[PDB]
Amino acid sequence: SKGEELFTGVVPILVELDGDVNGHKFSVRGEGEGDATNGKLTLKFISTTGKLPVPWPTLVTTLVQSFSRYPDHMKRHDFFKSAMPEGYVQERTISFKDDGTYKTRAEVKFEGDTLVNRIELKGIDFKEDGNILGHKLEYNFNDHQVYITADKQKNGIKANFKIRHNVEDGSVQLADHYQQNTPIGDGPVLLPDNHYLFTTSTLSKDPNEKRDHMVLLEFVTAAGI
């Protein structure tokens, strides 16, 4: 496709998240860049509202699969780039086992030269001293592969996958993800055969940054079944 051409080199990224979890209002702003040729993303995220009311790792999947590296032989299966520049809506439900649920809706699209991911998140039925609102989760991330399938009736894709978060306990906190993506424009998009995205994420901190923040480096590739 022709949306593929927009990801040729290094593309600046802006992420904006407005969140509300059990009534805690918070906002995240992220800036960085993506290099889809090599499936590399680098971003620094800031909590602009003060200390984050949920653990950073629970937000990683919400905070741009258009930067996945699709091998040459799977280009026909890259829905995410094919929807650009007009973009796509990405919606999820994230169910934290024995705790609350995030519902998210995001628009991913070009604004000028910048790939923007603008997100709204609402969390309900969290335990005020559970693993999430009680900040019991380690600052790290366990990636898991994502099985992408076509949803031809919505002209888009869907996926469902589980993420495991480490608890400072040593226990594990499951986050069950359900995902739907739908194009924003009317043009044609690529509906893919079933395939996976594999991700390697690294969370770090900036020693000079005093705001609550997350530095994130990710490498992502597509792989056929």
Please name which of 201, 199, 204 lies closest in space to residue 223, comparing C-alpha atoms.
199
Q: Calculate the CA dihedral of residues 20, 25, 31, 33 and round it to 10 degrees.
A: -10
Return the domain boundaries, the chain: 3-224
100 contacts 114 by C-beta, under 8 angstroms: no
Q: Quick check: helix, strand or coil at residue 135?
A: coil
**Sequence-separated (6 or more) residues with CB below 8 Å from residue 201:** 60, 141, 143, 216, 217, 218
Determination approach: X-ray
Specify the amino acid at residue 39. G
> Whole-angstrom Cα distance, residue 191 to residue 68?
16
Q: Which residues pair with 216 in a beta bridge?
A: 43, 203
**Sequence-separated (6 or more) residues with CB below 8 Å from residue 221:** 39, 68, 69, 70, 71, 197, 198
| 182 to 22, 100, 107: CA distances (angstroms) | 28, 25, 10
Please name which of 199, 187, 193 lies closest in space to residue 146, comparing C-alpha atoms.
199
Hey, what are 139's tokens?
């600052």
37 contacts 8 by C-beta, under 8 angstroms: yes
The three-point CA angle 171-176-178 to 5° equals: 165
Hey, what are 117's tokens?
């991911």
101 contacts 130 by C-beta, under 8 angstroms: no
The per-residue b/e assignment along 126-153, b for 16 or more CB within 10 angstroms, e otherwise, is beeeebbbeebbbeebebbebebebeee
CATH class of the domain whose range is 3-224 = mainly beta
Q: Calculate the CA dihedral of residues 208, 47, 45, 215 and round it to 10 degrees.
A: 50
The three-point CA angle 99-30-109 to 5° equals: 95
Q: Calculate the CA dihedral of residues 113, 117, 120, 123 and round it to 10 degrees.
A: -160
The 10 Å Cβ neighbour count of residue 61 is: 22
Please name which of 201, 215, 212 lies closest in space to residue 27, comparing C-alpha atoms.
212
* Cited resolution, angstroms: 2.0
117 contacts 184 by C-beta, under 8 angstroms: no
Q: How far apart are the first and last CA of the chain?
A: 22
Residue with tokens 């869907």: 158
